[PDB]
Ligand binder design. Structure first.
Ligand SMILES: Nc1ncnc2c1ncn2[C@@H]1O[C@H](COP(=O)(O)OP(=O)(O)OP(=O)(O)O)[C@@H](O)[C@H]1O
Ligand SMILES: [Mg+2]
Length: 297
């Protein structure tokens, strides 16, 4: 249990709810936090154990899939500081590809909106008559690129991906994205949870291999829905975040989402209920017990 301090590692970067540290020239520490985002705001109130639960989830899916991934040691690797144990992974440093590899099995969000405006999504001209939460058969590769800080990603088509990473690599990204999405979506649905869409971040290792990195198939990287009352044609509830969304936009919060100003803190009971939803998604899909996952509660 002798472990380095987080302060022993250089802070490299990161986004809203995760952190990245340099361990050495070829390894990083990939840290999930308990912070949660809703309506594109990072909320004041952390969700207890969220970082650990989502790390456990990513680790499960990395083990399920047979494709190369960025894991470089066990979840209890001694290079991991105690203060992030269970919510941090020792990973291989990759050259990240500048494209968001999104797979959509169902039509919602910007995919639906692009379809309603144009009849197409990311260069895919779709059948007429689709709508909110329609199943996409087959699932779509719907790549995007990151835009300015704070604003939504830009949907692009396959030709744009070719110009970003090369023709052969673009085809490789497309094929792998669809393959692993299809497998994971079937696995989750078998247990009563729909993986509506998901985003992969790929990088390339020293050998030129395509490597799956960042987070995979978590509620932060994906839209999860409860299959039990999946109803094409209406907006589906977020499996994990609906209690948060309902409280924020309900009569008790005092917050108007349309104001586009930072939301107030959550009730502790809502945070704990949300924690339980994350655990439920993890346990149902993985078939493992979160009580066995490492790290402090
Ligand atoms: N194995 C890896 N090697 C190198 N960089 C990585 C690796 N895994 C993830 N990253 C990168 O680290 C950066 C920070 O990670 P983080 O998940 O916070 O980014 P993000 O997904 O863009 O965040 P957000 O979705 O909140 O905007 C990302 O640009 C991601 O591509
Ligand atoms: Mg982040």
């Amino acid at each position: 249990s002798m472990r380095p301090s987080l302060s022993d590692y250089q802070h490299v970067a990161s986004g809203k709810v995760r952190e990245l540290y340099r361990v050495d020239d070829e390894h990083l520490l990939f840290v999930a936090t308990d912070r949660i985002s809703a309506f594109d705001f990072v909320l004041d109130t952390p969700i207890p154990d969220k970082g650990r639960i989502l790390t456990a989830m990513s680790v499960f899916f990395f083990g399920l899939l047979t494709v190369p991934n960025h894991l470089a040691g066990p979840p209890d690797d001694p290079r991991i500081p105690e203060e992030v144990l269970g919510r941090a992974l020792l990973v291989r440093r990759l050259d990240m590809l500048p494209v968001e590899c999104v797979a959509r099995g169902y039509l919602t969000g910007s995919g639906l909106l692009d379809y309603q405006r144009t009849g197409a999504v990311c260069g895919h001209v779709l059948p007429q008559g689709l709508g909110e939460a329609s199943r996409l058969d087959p699932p779509l590769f719907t790549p995007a690129t990151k835009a300015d800080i704070g604003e939504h990603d830009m949907n692009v088509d396959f030709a744009a991906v070719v110009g970003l990473v090369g023709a052969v690599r673009a085809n490789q990204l497309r094929d792998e994205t669809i393959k692993i999405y299809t497998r994971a979506a079937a696995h989750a649905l078998h247990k009563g949870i729909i993986l509506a869409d998901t985003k992969f971040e790929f990088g390339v290792d020293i050998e030129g291999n395509l490597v799956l990195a960042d987070e995979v198939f978590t509620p932060d990287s994906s839209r999860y829905w409860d299959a039990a009352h999946y109803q094409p044609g209406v907006v589906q509830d977020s499996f994990d975040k609906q209690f948060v969304r309902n409280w924020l936009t309900g009569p008790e919060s005092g917050w108007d989402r349309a104001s586009d100003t930072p939301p107030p803190p959550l009730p502790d009971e809502v945070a704990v209920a949300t924690r339980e939803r994350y655990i439920e998604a993890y346990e149902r899909i993985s078939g493992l017990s979160f009580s066995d996952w490492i790290g402090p509660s």
